[PDB]
Design a protein around this ligand. Structure first.
Ligand SMILES: Nc1ncnc2c1ncn2[C@@H]1O[C@H](COP(=O)(O)OP(=O)(O)OP(=O)(O)O)[C@@H](O)[C@H]1O
Ligand SMILES: Nc1ncnc2c1ncn2[C@@H]1O[C@H](COP(=O)(O)OP(=O)(O)OP(=O)(O)O)[C@@H](O)[C@H]1O
Lengths: 286, 285
């Protein structure tokens, strides 16, 4: 019965296949092979909703084709996307998949998130109550991010923070955070301190649960790294859902469930079509 | 005299980036605009705006972009064929605009690829000796060559703009009457034996190469806010000017083309940046 409010972003990740990245002045032919709903905010909110946690995703969409697509595709998930309607412009990433070329090149836009204001968001947490969670990633400016956590604090909400993309100035918000989820680089760069619950993820190398002075390690679940997209979002969402469903603060079992869920995501390609499904989640959380 | 253009039509999206990303890197970008475009559509639309009877043979998809494209084209004095659309996404182009150098473009071809050669040719059924077939580099070697061979069999004049470039296009010159290329294409495809050869060089003008003679036409100074479609504008207006005066492309045609392309570079977008019918008329007189 505790609910989760996620204030972050939502995008369209477009996978384009090309022989090689074109040089300036060049013009080539390519293939728009696929599109998937993306964004750390949306991925985390969607997976949380699939675990049976009543979740509200507060993110902005624009008035373009990708916007309508997002609003249409999100209806397939047991999540509520606020606000309805839209703004203008539109977050998404073009994933340039080359041929002989090794790694992909990524170009990402953030206009919708950068413009989404506090007066647009706060109203959608009007029905929040003490105990409810405000989950935030690193898609907003320091001022907006800090302001949202202060709002949560003034309502008695629990604050969860996953500072990714990283922002050096995020190292000042720790006092406003109840639960921190960071990967290795983030843990060393932001130096989270005094956070009552600290989780440090290290990919296929497992994760650490830290803070009642106690340090606990949870190995990753062996898996075929076919596509790691959203592995971190999966881990965070399931860890939180597990703790919520059992009525406790994140613990060792929460991390074990999360590792198991992330293992599924890594084994499948894409986002929504790769993440564990509601029944798969029900089974592992059991 | 009628001009048949067999090529593509798209929705162009312009992304502003610091510089083209390296393999394995994730960079930030900003979507600046979306507009109607396509090598085929751009050239056909401008020709039609100049008063040239033009027919664009290109495929649109059954998506929102397709409906938008068809709606926009309806406002132009051009005939788009076929009337119906195909069960495919309409073709689109990603224009990567870096703060420094020239734009990089990536264009899809799924819609154009569905429009088979057997389906396209019937749209030229009413062509007559003297009419023109204008093509760009949207199609494969085989498809492009087949259309030019068909044109030749019907006594039509052929115009070729090998863009996007395809290494194999170098084997097509004997079928080409008028060739328009930029400096990169000229070296890459080595045009030869073409009655009329035009080599464009951006802000540095364009060369007209005919029967041994070479003439240089300087560019009209302009503030380059958006260079997208500059080449298409130049080709279209040059061809239109010659056609209107009933001559082979000449120095005056390139001068007209230069003035038109300057307008295009001074404006933002694709279709929205092109000179309008009245501007073109005043320009051509
Ligand atoms: N190859 C893998 N095999 C099994 N589990 C994995 C693998 N990669 C990631 N995970 C699981 O997912 C958790 C999420 O991890 P990681 O620290 O890479 O996330 P992240 O850096 O936030 O993700 P992202 O690349 O999206 O930013 C890991 O601790 C692990 O349990
Ligand atoms: N910056 C500029 N200022 C004035 N005129 C220009 C400028 N850039 C291009 N032009 C005009 O447009 C003609 C079209 O030129 P350019 O050689 O860049 O074409 P292109 O390489 O085919 O471009 P694209 O295919 O991307 O439209 C030039 O010869 C010139 O007359």
């Amino acid at each position: 019965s505790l609910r989760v409010y996620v204030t972050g972003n939502i995008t369209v990740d477009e996978t384009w296949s090309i022989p090689d990245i074109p040089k300036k002045g060049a013009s080539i032919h390519g293939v728009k092979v696929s599109q998937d709903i993306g964004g750390k905010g949306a991925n985390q909110a969607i997976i949380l909703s699939r675990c049976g946690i009543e979740t509200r995703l507060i993110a902005a969409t624009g008035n373009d084709s990708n916007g309508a697509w997002i609003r249409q595709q999100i209806k397939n998930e047991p999540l509520m996307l606020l606000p309805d309607g839209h703004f203008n412009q539109h977050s998404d990433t073009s994933i340039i998949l080359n041929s002989a070329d090794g790694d992909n090149a990524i170009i990402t836009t953030t206009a919708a998130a950068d413009t989404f204001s506090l007066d647009e968001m706060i109203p959608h947490m009007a029905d929040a109550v003490a105990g409810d969670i405000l989950l935030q990633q690193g898609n907003f400016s320091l001022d907006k991010t800090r302001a949202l956590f202060q709002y949560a604090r003034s309502r008695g909400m629990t604050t969860v923070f996953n500072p990714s993309p990283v922002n050096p100035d995020f190292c000042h918000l720790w006092p406003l955070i109840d639960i921190a989820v960071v990967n290795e680089s983030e843990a060393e760069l932001l130096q989270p301190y005094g956070v009552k619950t600290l989780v440090i993820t290290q990919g296929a190398a497992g994760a650490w649960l830290v803070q009642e002075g106690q340090r606990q390690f949870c190995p990753a679940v062996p898996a075929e790294a076919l596509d790691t997209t959203g592995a971190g979002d999966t881990f965070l969402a399931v860890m939180l859902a597990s703790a919520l469903l059992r009525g406790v603060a994140p613990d060792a079992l929460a991390l074990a469930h999360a590792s198991r869920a992330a293992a599924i995501t890594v084994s499948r390609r894409g986002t929504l079509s790769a993440f564990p499904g509601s029944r798969e989640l029900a089974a592992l959380l059991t």
